[PDB]
């Protein structure tokens, strides 16, 4: 049945090389939507951060369209191997290192609804570039981005949204996965620039960084202050308790320097 | 605040061909595109082309693919438009409007210059 | 290729709330269009006001907003001012290109 609808689509004249038809001539229109799984390995040396994540994407192929709303015919089919579709040449503008996951199958999902919308999910894993600036240290903030085009196709042909409806959605415990951080405020945006070859557009998603400072208080910033206090009772002692204030002043020093080791 | 001065009234013969100066104040120029307008009598607005003054690129109209031609000085901060080859059909005002995203095309029309009226008649 | 159409000119009263739509002619005015409303203050004043996505110009006044009812683009004054009466100008992005209107000579009346 199914394979039965898969085969009837690709027997026609279909080229997953030409770009899908449009009313107007417009661009063909990808609905993005962005799941974030895991954030880890956040470096400040190389201005790097690796992050997996599950990329959605969404547009309408009217070739690919096998039916109606009433019919006896499955909503959706899933693409089985050795059918090609147009897919959009999108990619990571930001991204150093990216792989993704072949294990058994590899790990993607493309869903042919029958009015001729595609559904396009796969798991990836990213090292994205995020410059990193630590003027601050300890109480800083950092903000790194994931940006998201395509590479060929300019605004003419590809146009790219945010879904509607929750565009990121983090996973569970993201917040806690970050040893040295604490993300505050994730946010959705559009990052589309003129290049030289043409107008591209573009997604950004936005994770906010925020460092703990509780630490640094009970480990740096407190005992160092009650140190300094502690060097100046000295001088409340007199001149000739020099075993008092010899000692005081060395030991206070000494332990000043351990601290910043 | 900012602005956005262009330059003088101009009055040229059929053939010849000047450019319009637009004089950037008031941000950090690299970071916002420009975009350039032509207002005439006869017509509506026709939007010409945009530049990217950090990229250099540029992007055209179709109807004005060799008519206009888009240039930039960063260290002035000024966005230069060239129309060549003048006829009585390219009498009108143009204006140069910026965009209004930090360095990126957010396709949307921030401030306006005062406009420069060009009049070319033989 | 295709043509914006706004109204001739409409008039408001100080205080009330007036609507400019700005309609295309290749169909309905999606998200894709970007519909940027342009105000013209007379002696060839031109400021931006709503753009793109969800952008505003700075210094816009909260009683301008744009939104899309119906088919087509449209530019809501919520508390009319006398220093709001302009020509208005709606500009759609078709692929590449932008494409202005006859432009709405809105006027209020002092």
């Known amino acids: 049945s199914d394979s039965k609808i898969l085969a009837h689509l690709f027997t026609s004249g279909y080229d997953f090389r030409v770009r899908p038809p449009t009313d107007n001539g417009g661009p063909v229109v990808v609905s993005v939507n962005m799941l974030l799984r895991t954030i880890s390995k956040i470096d400040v040396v190389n201005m790097e951060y690796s992050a997996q994540l599950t990329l959605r994407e969404s547009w309408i192929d009217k070739r690919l369209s096998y039916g109606v709303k009433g019919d006896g015919q499955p909503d959706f089919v899933i693409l089985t191997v050795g059918h090609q579709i147009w897919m959009p040449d999108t990619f990571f503008p930001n991204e150093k290192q990216a792989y993704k996951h072949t294990i058994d199958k590899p790990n993607v999902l493309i869903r042919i609804h029958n009015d001729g919308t595609v559904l396009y999910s796969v798991r990836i894993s990213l090292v994205l570039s995020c410059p990193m600036y630590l003027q601050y240290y300890p109480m800083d903030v950092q903000q790194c981005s994931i940006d998201l085009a395509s590479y060929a196709y300019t605004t003419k042909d590809i146009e790219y949204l945010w879904k509607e409806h929750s565009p990121l959605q983090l996973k569970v415990g993201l917040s806690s996965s970050l040893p040295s951080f604490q993300l505050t405020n994730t946010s959705t945006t559009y990052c589309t620039s003129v290049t030289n070859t043409g107008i591209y557009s573009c997604l950004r998603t936005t994770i906010q960084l925020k460092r703990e400072f509780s630490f640094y208080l009970l480990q740096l910033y407190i005992p160092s202050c009650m140190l300094v206090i502690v060097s100046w009772v000295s001088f409340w002692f007199d001149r000739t308790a020099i075993p008092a204030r010899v000692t005081l002043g060395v030991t206070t020093l000494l332990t000043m320097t351990a601290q910043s080791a | 605040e900012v602005q956005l001065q262009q330059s003088g009234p101009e009055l040229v013969r059929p053939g010849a061909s000047m450019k319009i100066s637009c004089k950037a104040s008031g941000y950090s120029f690299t970071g916002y595109t420009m975009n350039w307008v032509k207002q005439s009598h006869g017509k509506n607005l026709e939007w010409i082309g945009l530049?990217?003054?950090?990229?250099?690129?540029?992007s055209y109209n179709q109807k004005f693919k060799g008519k206009a031609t888009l240039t930039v000085d960063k260290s002035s901060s000024t966005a230069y438009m060239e129309l060549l080859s003048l006829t009585s059909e390219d009498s009108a005002v143009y204006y140069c409007?910026?965009?209004?995203?930090?360095?990126?095309?957010?396709?949307?029309?921030?401030?306006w210059g005062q406009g420069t009226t060009l009049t070319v008649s033989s | 290729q295709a043509v914006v159409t706004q109204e001739s000119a409409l008039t408001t009263s100080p205080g009330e709330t007036v609507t400019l739509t700005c309609r295309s002619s290749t169909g309905a005015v999606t998200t894709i269009n970007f519909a940027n409303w342009v105000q013209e203050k007379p002696d060839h004043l031109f400021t931006g006001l709503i753009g793109?996505?969800?952008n505003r110009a700075p210094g816009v006044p909260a009683r301008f907003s744009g939104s899309l009812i119906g088919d087509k683009a449209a530019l809501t004054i919520t508390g009319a001012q006398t220093e709001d009466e302009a020509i208005y100008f709606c500009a759609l992005w078709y692929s590449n290109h932008w494409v202005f209107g006859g432009g709405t000579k809105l006027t209020v009346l002092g």
């Open positions: 530049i990217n003054p950090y990229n250099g690129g540029t």
């Open positions: 793109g996505i969800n």
């Open positions: 409007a910026r965009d209004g995203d930090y360095y990126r095309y957010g396709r949307y029309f921030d401030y």
